[PDB]
Design a protein around this ligand. Sequence first.
Ligand code: PKA
Length: 169
Amino acid sequence: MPESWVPAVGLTLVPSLGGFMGAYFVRGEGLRWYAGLQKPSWHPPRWTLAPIWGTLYSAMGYGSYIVWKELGGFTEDAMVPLGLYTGQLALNWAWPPIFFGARQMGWALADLLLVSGVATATTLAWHRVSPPAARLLYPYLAWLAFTTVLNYYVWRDNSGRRGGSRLAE
Ligand SMILES: CC[C@@H](C)N(C)C(=O)c1cc2ccccc2c(-c2ccccc2Cl)n1
């Protein structure tokens, strides 16, 4: 039944819901909390990147199609890659603690799950089965890349107070 593939759309929508909740914190009252925290001046509007999921959303769907092209459809072979993404992503969903509160600066946890979670699961499955699909992710690298640098600016500003010895002259 065609319904078997339909979940592919759901596969990409699922992760979007998780990241949204984390972004919702800084987006809302967190803004007040951020007043204490310093955000890089080159930081773009919150409503701008927040929509990124829309960008990754479509890519994840079409990317899976590429995998379907090689396998010829959904077969035990196809279940391993796409299935892993749904499963591995869920296990990772359990990692973030800030989702419940986020009141604490621990927001950094969103960064690790965000980047490694979405990339680690997709990379092992799609890359091996469909290397070309990895290119489709292209924007994923840029989006995740911003969080790495963006996170240091906020955390370093506060965390900078401690671990100063970590840096050399
Ligand atoms: C803090 C500014 C955020 C909203 N920004 C401009 C982003 O591009 C962004 C988008 C996201 C989308 C999904 C999940 C997370 C983010 C995070 C982010 C990065 C590190 C820690 C916490 C968050 Cl919400 N940051």
